[PDB]
Amino acid sequence: NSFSGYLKLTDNVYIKNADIVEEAKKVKPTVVVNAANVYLKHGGGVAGALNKATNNAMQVESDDYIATNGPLKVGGSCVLSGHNLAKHCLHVVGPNVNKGEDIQLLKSAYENFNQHEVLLAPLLSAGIFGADPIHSLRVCVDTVRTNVYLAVFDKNLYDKLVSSFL
């Protein structure tokens, strides 16, 4: 397929040092995953980058979703438009360690991926959500059964994830 340059970690998990926005623009996947919060407020991190790439269309759509349905749950998800990046965006809420949220909900968050055959995704609960990215990758491998292409922005983190993988 159109995913190029990934390292194979397992039967179904692949990883690349890449900006998820640029990779979505190049591949136009069926599903891109957003690292969302429960309010779908896309201010920073991956969410802020994806929203900016849609010229704020993602935020306008999200505000309507919240007005109609209320907040997500931690560990939950919703499927919205992918705008100019993808057919669909799967907004998944991993726990935010900095808010005291239970890291065990990371497994629930990754289970949402199993409803989709192929996904382009970031590591959940990494970055500004405060969890250890090595732990996030382990939970991903052990939970997701569908095909997941992981994009890791930071080269030093990418190298550490690959070189410590077991």
Curated annotation (Swiss-Prot):
Changing S163L: In strain: Gamma/P.1. It comes from the Viruses. It is a multi-pass membrane protein. Inhibited in vitro by GRL-0617. It catalyses: Thiol-dependent hydrolysis of ester, thioester, amide, peptide and isopeptide bonds formed by the C-terminal Gly of ubiquitin (a 76-residue protein attached to proteins as an intracellular targeting signal). It is found in: Host endoplasmic reticulum membrane. Residues 1-166 form the Macro domain. Responsible for the cleavages located at the N-terminus of the replicase polyprotein. Participates together with nsp4 in the assembly of virally-induced cytoplasmic double-membrane vesicles necessary for viral replication. Antagonizes innate immune induction of type I interferon by blocking the phosphorylation, dimerization and subsequent nuclear translocation of host IRF3. Also prevents host NF-kappa-B signaling. In addition, PL-PRO possesses a deubiquitinating/deISGylating activity and processes both 'Lys-48'- and 'Lys-63'-linked polyubiquitin chains from cellular substrates. May form homohexamers. Interacts with N protein. This is Papain-like protease nsp3.
